[PDB]
Amino acid sequence: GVATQLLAAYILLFDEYNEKKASAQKDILIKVLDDGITKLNEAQKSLLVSSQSF
Amino acid sequence: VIPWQTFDETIKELSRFKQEYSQAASVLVGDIKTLLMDSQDKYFEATQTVYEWC
């Protein structure tokens, strides 16, 4: 729900190169993707342990 | 004149043999089942990790 709007904001703001917001857009992208990789990995490990419990 | 006690002892011995070996085999087959399911979970985890890297 957060990622599909931040990426749409990325496509909307940078149809042309806006050099003022270029130093912060990279930090926003790195922050949201490093959050997402950690959440998806923890979800997979939780589902794996729940599968191994039976 | 009718040997009934020896008949009962023979029936109880031939039943106790089968009870003992059913009790001995069931636990071991139930342990092999758990090992074969844990192996499939580890196999799925390893192949999914390599697939996600590729």
PDB file of C-alpha atoms in Angstrom:
ATOM      1  CA  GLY A   1       0.000   0.000   0.000  1.00  0.00           C
ATOM      2  CA  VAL A   2       2.923   2.379   0.547  1.00  0.00           C
ATOM      3  CA  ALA A   3       5.152   1.122  -2.270  1.00  0.00           C
ATOM      4  CA  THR A   4       2.560   1.326  -5.060  1.00  0.00           C
ATOM      5  CA  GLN A   5       2.019   5.033  -4.317  1.00  0.00           C
ATOM      6  CA  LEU A   6       5.644   6.053  -3.778  1.00  0.00           C
ATOM      7  CA  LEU A   7       6.609   4.467  -7.103  1.00  0.00           C
ATOM      8  CA  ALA A   8       3.698   6.222  -8.827  1.00  0.00           C
ATOM      9  CA  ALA A   9       4.950   9.477  -7.296  1.00  0.00           C
ATOM     10  CA  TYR A  10       8.393   8.659  -8.729  1.00  0.00           C
ATOM     11  CA  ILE A  11       6.963   8.181 -12.235  1.00  0.00           C
ATOM     12  CA  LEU A  12       4.789  11.304 -11.902  1.00  0.00           C
ATOM     13  CA  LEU A  13       7.480  13.695 -10.638  1.00  0.00           C
ATOM     14  CA  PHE A  14      10.313  12.651 -12.967  1.00  0.00           C
ATOM     15  CA  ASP A  15       8.853  12.680 -16.461  1.00  0.00           C
ATOM     16  CA  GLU A  16      11.582  15.292 -16.911  1.00  0.00           C
ATOM     17  CA  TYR A  17      14.664  15.655 -14.724  1.00  0.00           C
ATOM     18  CA  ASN A  18      13.756  17.757 -11.676  1.00  0.00           C
ATOM     19  CA  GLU A  19      17.208  18.397 -10.211  1.00  0.00           C
ATOM     20  CA  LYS A  20      15.939  19.917  -6.952  1.00  0.00           C
ATOM     21  CA  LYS A  21      14.181  16.759  -5.717  1.00  0.00           C
ATOM     22  CA  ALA A  22      16.820  14.402  -7.141  1.00  0.00           C
ATOM     23  CA  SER A  23      18.864  14.128  -3.937  1.00  0.00           C
ATOM     24  CA  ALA A  24      15.836  13.175  -1.807  1.00  0.00           C
ATOM     25  CA  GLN A  25      14.043  10.836  -4.235  1.00  0.00           C
ATOM     26  CA  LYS A  26      17.014   8.457  -4.097  1.00  0.00           C
ATOM     27  CA  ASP A  27      16.868   8.392  -0.288  1.00  0.00           C
ATOM     28  CA  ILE A  28      13.102   7.748  -0.382  1.00  0.00           C
ATOM     29  CA  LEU A  29      13.577   4.867  -2.852  1.00  0.00           C
ATOM     30  CA  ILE A  30      16.447   3.291  -0.873  1.00  0.00           C
ATOM     31  CA  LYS A  31      14.500   3.595   2.397  1.00  0.00           C
ATOM     32  CA  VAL A  32      11.264   2.055   1.102  1.00  0.00           C
ATOM     33  CA  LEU A  33      13.010  -0.808  -0.722  1.00  0.00           C
ATOM     34  CA  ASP A  34      15.255  -1.649   2.249  1.00  0.00           C
ATOM     35  CA  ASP A  35      12.111  -1.724   4.394  1.00  0.00           C
ATOM     36  CA  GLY A  36      10.357  -3.972   1.887  1.00  0.00           C
ATOM     37  CA  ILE A  37      13.131  -6.565   1.514  1.00  0.00           C
ATOM     38  CA  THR A  38      13.297  -7.008   5.302  1.00  0.00           C
ATOM     39  CA  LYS A  39       9.509  -7.325   5.681  1.00  0.00           C
ATOM     40  CA  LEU A  40       9.199  -9.867   2.847  1.00  0.00           C
ATOM     41  CA  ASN A  41      12.096 -11.962   4.180  1.00  0.00           C
ATOM     42  CA  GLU A  42      10.633 -12.041   7.705  1.00  0.00           C
ATOM     43  CA  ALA A  43       7.209 -13.001   6.316  1.00  0.00           C
ATOM     44  CA  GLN A  44       8.735 -15.905   4.370  1.00  0.00           C
ATOM     45  CA  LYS A  45      10.653 -17.146   7.423  1.00  0.00           C
ATOM     46  CA  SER A  46       7.487 -16.993   9.557  1.00  0.00           C
ATOM     47  CA  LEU A  47       5.469 -18.955   6.987  1.00  0.00           C
ATOM     48  CA  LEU A  48       8.293 -21.512   6.723  1.00  0.00           C
ATOM     49  CA  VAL A  49       8.311 -22.144  10.489  1.00  0.00           C
ATOM     50  CA  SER A  50       4.502 -22.389  10.452  1.00  0.00           C
ATOM     51  CA  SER A  51       4.762 -24.991   7.680  1.00  0.00           C
ATOM     52  CA  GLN A  52       7.400 -26.948   9.614  1.00  0.00           C
ATOM     53  CA  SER A  53       5.283 -27.075  12.795  1.00  0.00           C
ATOM     54  CA  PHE A  54       3.017 -29.919  11.532  1.00  0.00           C
TER      55      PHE A  54
ATOM     56  CA  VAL B   1      -8.776 -84.514  30.475  1.00  0.00           C
ATOM     57  CA  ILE B   2      -9.134 -81.281  28.433  1.00  0.00           C
ATOM     58  CA  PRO B   3      -5.964 -79.126  28.478  1.00  0.00           C
ATOM     59  CA  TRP B   4      -7.468 -75.638  28.455  1.00  0.00           C
ATOM     60  CA  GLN B   5      -4.820 -73.758  30.456  1.00  0.00           C
ATOM     61  CA  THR B   6      -2.039 -74.675  28.015  1.00  0.00           C
ATOM     62  CA  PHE B   7      -4.319 -73.597  25.150  1.00  0.00           C
ATOM     63  CA  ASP B   8      -4.852 -70.209  26.828  1.00  0.00           C
ATOM     64  CA  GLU B   9      -1.110 -69.810  27.481  1.00  0.00           C
ATOM     65  CA  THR B  10      -0.326 -70.554  23.824  1.00  0.00           C
ATOM     66  CA  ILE B  11      -2.941 -68.070  22.560  1.00  0.00           C
ATOM     67  CA  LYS B  12      -1.682 -65.368  24.935  1.00  0.00           C
ATOM     68  CA  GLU B  13       1.959 -65.920  23.929  1.00  0.00           C
ATOM     69  CA  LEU B  14       1.201 -65.775  20.197  1.00  0.00           C
ATOM     70  CA  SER B  15      -0.851 -62.619  20.786  1.00  0.00           C
ATOM     71  CA  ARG B  16       1.824 -60.952  22.936  1.00  0.00           C
ATOM     72  CA  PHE B  17       4.437 -61.442  20.183  1.00  0.00           C
ATOM     73  CA  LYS B  18       2.275 -59.548  17.679  1.00  0.00           C
ATOM     74  CA  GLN B  19       1.376 -56.804  20.179  1.00  0.00           C
ATOM     75  CA  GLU B  20       5.067 -56.252  20.993  1.00  0.00           C
ATOM     76  CA  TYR B  21       6.174 -55.986  17.379  1.00  0.00           C
ATOM     77  CA  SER B  22       3.259 -53.742  16.352  1.00  0.00           C
ATOM     78  CA  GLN B  23       4.158 -51.398  19.228  1.00  0.00           C
ATOM     79  CA  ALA B  24       7.813 -51.522  18.158  1.00  0.00           C
ATOM     80  CA  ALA B  25       7.247 -50.907  14.436  1.00  0.00           C
ATOM     81  CA  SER B  26       4.594 -48.162  14.621  1.00  0.00           C
ATOM     82  CA  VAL B  27       6.758 -45.610  16.465  1.00  0.00           C
ATOM     83  CA  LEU B  28       9.681 -46.134  14.083  1.00  0.00           C
ATOM     84  CA  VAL B  29       7.554 -45.723  10.947  1.00  0.00           C
ATOM     85  CA  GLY B  30       5.992 -42.611  12.500  1.00  0.00           C
ATOM     86  CA  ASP B  31       9.473 -41.194  13.058  1.00  0.00           C
ATOM     87  CA  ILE B  32      10.497 -41.913   9.452  1.00  0.00           C
ATOM     88  CA  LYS B  33       7.362 -40.022   8.321  1.00  0.00           C
ATOM     89  CA  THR B  34       8.412 -36.921  10.297  1.00  0.00           C
ATOM     90  CA  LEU B  35      11.956 -37.101   8.895  1.00  0.00           C
ATOM     91  CA  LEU B  36      10.641 -37.406   5.325  1.00  0.00           C
ATOM     92  CA  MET B  37       8.442 -34.334   5.786  1.00  0.00           C
ATOM     93  CA  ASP B  38      11.219 -32.232   7.364  1.00  0.00           C
ATOM     94  CA  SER B  39      13.507 -33.159   4.454  1.00  0.00           C
ATOM     95  CA  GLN B  40      10.907 -31.890   1.979  1.00  0.00           C
ATOM     96  CA  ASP B  41      10.600 -28.601   3.884  1.00  0.00           C
ATOM     97  CA  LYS B  42      14.395 -28.093   3.830  1.00  0.00           C
ATOM     98  CA  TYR B  43      14.503 -28.987   0.116  1.00  0.00           C
ATOM     99  CA  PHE B  44      11.763 -26.453  -0.680  1.00  0.00           C
ATOM    100  CA  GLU B  45      13.534 -23.719   1.305  1.00  0.00           C
ATOM    101  CA  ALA B  46      16.894 -24.295  -0.415  1.00  0.00           C
ATOM    102  CA  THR B  47      15.494 -24.438  -3.956  1.00  0.00           C
ATOM    103  CA  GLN B  48      13.303 -21.370  -3.370  1.00  0.00           C
ATOM    104  CA  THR B  49      16.288 -19.380  -2.053  1.00  0.00           C
ATOM    105  CA  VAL B  50      18.389 -20.268  -5.111  1.00  0.00           C
ATOM    106  CA  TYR B  51      15.463 -19.453  -7.445  1.00  0.00           C
ATOM    107  CA  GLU B  52      14.956 -16.037  -5.820  1.00  0.00           C
ATOM    108  CA  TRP B  53      18.661 -15.258  -6.213  1.00  0.00           C
ATOM    109  CA  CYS B  54      18.721 -16.307  -9.881  1.00  0.00           C
TER     110      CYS B  54
END
